[PDB]
Amino acid sequence: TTTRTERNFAGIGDVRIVYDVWTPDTAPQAVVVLAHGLGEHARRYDHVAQRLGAAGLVTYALDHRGHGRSGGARVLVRDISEYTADFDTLVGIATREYPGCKRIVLGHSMGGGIVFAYGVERPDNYDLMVLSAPAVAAQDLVSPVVAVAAKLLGVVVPGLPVQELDFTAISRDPEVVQAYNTDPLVHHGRVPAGIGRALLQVGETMPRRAPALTAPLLVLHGTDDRLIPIEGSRRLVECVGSADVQLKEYPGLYHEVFNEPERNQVLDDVVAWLTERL
C-alpha cells in the first residue's frame, strides 16, 4: 500500500508549487522525482507511483507552474530554467528527507525535456534517469514559421498560441483520451510560445549537452507515437555519454506508454531496470 501526501513549496517567482509524496509501507529503496508533460498534471500518474511504491520506491511528483493545482498562469513559462529550478527544488526536498537513498529522475514528454535539461545541468545530482517519450528535439516537431515565432515571442508574450496539438494521439485507448478531454485541470488549448521556446532551448542544444549525461539512462517510446516520433529517442541514446543506456521501443503503442493498454508491462520493465541498479 502506497500513501499519497500533498505538500507545496515556493517555486521561482513565488509561484505556489503543489506536489504529491507517495510513500510505501516498506523501507525506502530510493526516491523518484517525477515531471509530467505539457498541459497535464501529477495526478495523471497515480498508478505509476503506486507501481513504483510496490517496489519500495518513494515518488515525489509536482504540478509544474501553470498546471494542475499549482499557481501561475496556465501553461505559461518564459525559460526552461523556470521548470528546471522548480524540479531542482523538489529534488532537494527528497534528498534531504531520504538521505542515503539513490535518486531517480523520471519525466514524460515535456517533463522528459525538463529532466534531460536538469540532468545535463547537474550530471552528478541524481543516480538514475528514466525518460518517457522525451521532448528533446522540438525543432523537429514545429515548422520553421512556428520555430521563429516561439523564439521571438516566448519571453515577451509567452501565452501566445503557436501550435495546435492532436490530443487523440496521446493514447490509443479511447478511455484515456476521453479522460484527458474531460479533466477540468488539463490544458485543452494550443501550444503557447513560451513552452515552445523553452522546449526549443532543450532541443537545439541536445546533441552537445547529452555527452555530459553519465548516469544510467532508460528511454521508453511507443513506435506509433505520432506526437513525438520515436526517431528522436533513437538519436538521443546515441548522443548521451552514458555507457548504460537503453531505448525500450514498444511496438504499436502511442505517446503515453504509461497510460496505454500495455502500461503494466511498460512499468514492469521500468521497475526491473531500476531495481537491479539500486
Numbering used by the authors: 2 to 279
Article, verbatim:
One of those enzymes is the mycobacterial monoacylglycerol lipase Rv0183, also termed mtbMGL, hydrolyzing monoacylglycerol (MG) into glycerol and an unesterified fatty acid (FA). The biochemical characterization of mtbMGL showed a strong preference for monoacylglycerols (MG) and suggests it as a secreted lipase. mtbMGL belongs to the family of serine hydrolases, with an α/β-hydrolase core fold and a distinct cap domain. The active site is formed by residues Ser110, His256 and Asp226. In this work, we determined the crystal structures of a surface-entropy reduced variant K74A Rv0183/mtbMGL in its free form and in complex with a substrate mimicking inhibitor.
